[PDB]
Every structure is written in structure tokens, then in C-alpha cells.
Amino acid sequence: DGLRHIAAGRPVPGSVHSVSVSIPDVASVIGYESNDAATLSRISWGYPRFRPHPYVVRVAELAAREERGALLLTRSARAARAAAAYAGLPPGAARDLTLGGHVLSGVRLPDRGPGAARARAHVMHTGGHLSSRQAEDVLWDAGLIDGRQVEETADDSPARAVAQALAGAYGVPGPRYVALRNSGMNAVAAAVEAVTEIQRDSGRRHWLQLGWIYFDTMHLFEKKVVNVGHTTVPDPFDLAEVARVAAAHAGGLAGIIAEIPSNPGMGVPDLPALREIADRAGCALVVDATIATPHNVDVVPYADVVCESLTKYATGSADVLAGAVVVAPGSPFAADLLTVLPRYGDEPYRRDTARVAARIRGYAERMVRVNANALALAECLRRHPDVVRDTSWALDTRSAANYRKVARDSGGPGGLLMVDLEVPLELVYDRLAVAKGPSFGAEFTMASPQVFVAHYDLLTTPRGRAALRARGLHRDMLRVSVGTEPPELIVETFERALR
Ligand SMILES: [Mg+2]
User: Fold this and answer.
1) Residues 173, 329: contact at Cβ < 8 Å?
2) What's the CA gap between 405 and 270, in Å, rounded?
3) Of 36, 185, 441, 457, which has the maximum CB count within 10 A?
4) Which structural domain range is residue 189 located in?
5) 344, 392: one domain
6) What's the gap in Å between 391 CA and the centre of ligand 1?
7) Distance, CA 495 to ligand 1 centroid (Å)?
């Protein structure tokens, strides 16, 4: 059902639990990212960490009625307590509520002050939100909705099934080394918090962020959602600078965090070299491998901890959030990580896990087709030098050598291409017949105006645009996430939009 125009505002793929939404022209993108009220009425749906799902909103409204007058719902009481503490709210702000025979946890937010924004940010950047499947079950059990979304699930021991599948894909001995979390960000946050606690006793409290990486991961450090010091090394290829910064913090580095490739710039760091630096520093190396997938790269030998957002290609359905933490068995930190990790983050609601268990069965086969499509589209983009200024991806001239260091013999580039345009984004994006909107990693091809998604605020002024330019980014860029459609049809779809 891919490669078609989707009407603006329709949830994508269409399920009640859809994580994306059609935002098919740049005018709508600007209206959406600038919170224009008319645009948000037309396009009210969004990614569930960024725009609360309507069922979650309804559950919060009804749980508040039963003092009465804002409630931010969370996945767990633990998450509510953490968001309240981070936001500076009194401990009683985190409360447990009931509706339809279910226990709910959330934070009562103040009407004035920055407390409400801080609590919302904590829940957002750590993925500690209540899922739409859990809210749907609350409403259905209470008799407040007629029916539930029908979908394929694998309900028999789904957390074990998912953890076993990931253990095999990552090459670790078994599910003992895999922890499932509420979303990709919940996994990243749990891994960072667990490493931080293990390292605290030795006086190691500082983190190095390698390059510009996923924006919510950057916000975890910048906003001190995780309460550590940090330094960003802006060039992920700049190993001499990485070593210089590590030497300046010698004996004080808790960890280095890196992505392979990075979101959205698509830079591939030198993981073997980073392992040697981390070994000399006594710090942990945490690697987010979402964009490559474990079917394309073997990074466990070099990382102490690997994180993945299962929301993307692991499911291919654009309809469930989940994350995974994989602890390397050979890491010096492994025993402590397995002891400490249960204290951080939350497992997904089990109905979400059962959806992942059904969808993950096709992961390896999915990636064979995705890899071939990305290779075919990259060649197409190179043949349009009057429209495409460059394409950043795993096998470009910046990243190919580093990628080959960890790529599997069967391994391909993954599905993501970051397209830098010589024309205004409107001239390509508005006419492109793919699913345009947030998230990526579906079996249908998607595209995102990703600089607007991550950095709309910086796009709006000259100095903000200068800051983005220093990161290699600008307005007229399109992140493409190829699906599993026939490669000739994907190529033809892009040829029609590029001319
Ligand atoms: Mg460039």
C-alpha cells in the first residue's frame, strides 16, 4: 500500500495505534512544527511521545474527574516520581489513580511556573509515557469505547520471544543479556542511568557525546534529565579530538555515547577505535544501532551496551513503541549492568510487547529488501545532480570505511538516506508520493523533513540557521526511509518528484 499520496492529517498507517501521520507539504510541516492552531486541527495526530494520543488524553480527563481541576500520565509510578523530582514538584505531585479496574500513574502539573514543561520534557525524552494500547484497554474495560483495534499479535510469552529474537540478532548468549524498555528513548535513558550509577563510586560522572545524534538523546544530556556533566565532540570522525577530550577528563569519564549511523546526519563512527579509547579511559561505550539494525552490523564486540528503538525497522509496522538494551557479555561492566538495569526504565505494556513479538518475526527478511531498495535509490539520487546536492548514508565516501569495520558479511546499508537538496524542499517534498511524516522504519517508504522535526526553532532565524550549518544541516533536506516495495517502483516514484 506504499508509494501513494496520503491525505493530510490521516494517521499513518491507519491503525488506532499509528505512530505517524500524513504531513504531505512543507506548508503543513511549518504549520505543524510552529503549532499553528488551524494546522493542528487538520493534522491533530502525531508521534505518541510528542502529541498525546486521544485515548491517553481521555483517560487523564476521566481519572481526574474521580483535586478535580492538568494530569500527565506515565507508564509507571517510578516514571511519575522521576518526572516530578526532575520538574521540582512536591513529591505528592506523583499520584496513583484508578479507572475501569486499572491503576494509573501520573503527575499533577502546576498551572503556573516551568514545572509543567519540565515534567512533560522528562516523560518525553525518556519515553516514560502511557501507551495507547494500555489506554485503549482502560477505556474498553470501563465501557467507554465500543471496540478495540484489531491487529496481529503473538501473545504467548511475548517478552521472552522478543528478547530471544534480539539475542540471536545481536549474537549474545540469550535473553538474560536483553532488557526490553518502554520505547527506544526509555532504553537509551536506562542504559545511560545504569552506566552512570555503576561509575559513580569511582568518581566518573562525565559523558562524551560523539557527534550530533538523535535529538531526544541530546536533550537528555543538555536538559540534565540525566544529571551528569557532558561534552559534545561535534565531528564523529574526529578521533584525535575524541582522545583529546577524553584525556582532559582522564579518570572522570563515565561513558561515551555514539550512534551508528547517526540520526539524521548519517555519520558512521569508528567503533573499533572508540573501543580502544574507552578501554584507556575506563569508561563504557554505549552505542545506539537503531539505524543500521543488528542484521547489518555486529557492534556487540565493540560496545559495552547497545540500544535499539524497536519502533522502527524491528517491527516495520509504524504502530508500536518499544526499546531494547543489550549488554555485551564480555564487558567489564556486564555483571554490574545486569544487577543495576532493573532499577531504570520500564518494560513495555505487555500488549505492546505482543505486537512487537508478531512483527519482529520478519525482521531479517525485511532488511534484505530494505537494503536492496536503499542501494537502488542511492544510485538514482546520484543521477540527479541538478536537484540533489549530496546524499549522506552509510556507504557514502565519509562513512563507508568506518561502516565496513562492523558490517556483517551479509550486511547492507539499512534503509535511511539523508538527502540534501539544491532546490527548496517544497519542489520535491510536496509532490513526492510516499508517506510523509514523523518516524521511520516501516515496510512502506517514508520521508521526513527532518530538520523541521528536530530543529524548527533553529530554522527560524539567521543565527539559528548558522548553528545548523555548523552541524552540516539546513532547511532543504529530506530523510528517506525506504520500505520493502519493488526497487523499480521506489526509483520511479523519486524520479517523478525530482524532475
Ligand atoms: Mg553534507
Assistant:
1) yes
2) 8
3) 185
4) 158-360
5) no
6) 7
7) 21
- The answer to whether position 138 is within a domain reads no
Q: Specify burial of residue 103 (Cβ count, 10 A radius: 0-12, 13-18, 19+).
A: exposed
Shared domain for 219 and 335, answered yes or no, is yes
Q: 338 and 368, same structural domain?
A: no
Ligand 1 center from residue 462 Cα (angstroms): 19
The answer to whether the Cα torsion of 184, 185, 189, 195 is positive or negative is positive
C-alpha 32/C-alpha 387 separation (Å) is 26
- Of 92, 115, 130, which residue sits at a domain end? 130
CA of 440 to the centre of ligand 1 (A): 21
Same domain, 243 and 305: yes
Resolution (angstroms) stands at: 1.5
Beta carbons within 10 angstroms of residue 362's beta carbon = 16
Write down the experimental method used for this entry. Answer: X-ray
Are 293 and 402 within one domain? no
Ligand 1 center–CA 385 separation, angstroms: 14
Residue 406 C-beta-side C-alpha neighbours within 13 Å: 31
- Tell me the CA–centroid distance for residue 468 and ligand 1, in Å: 12
Report residue 475 CA to chain centroid gap.
21
* Count of domains forming the chain: 3
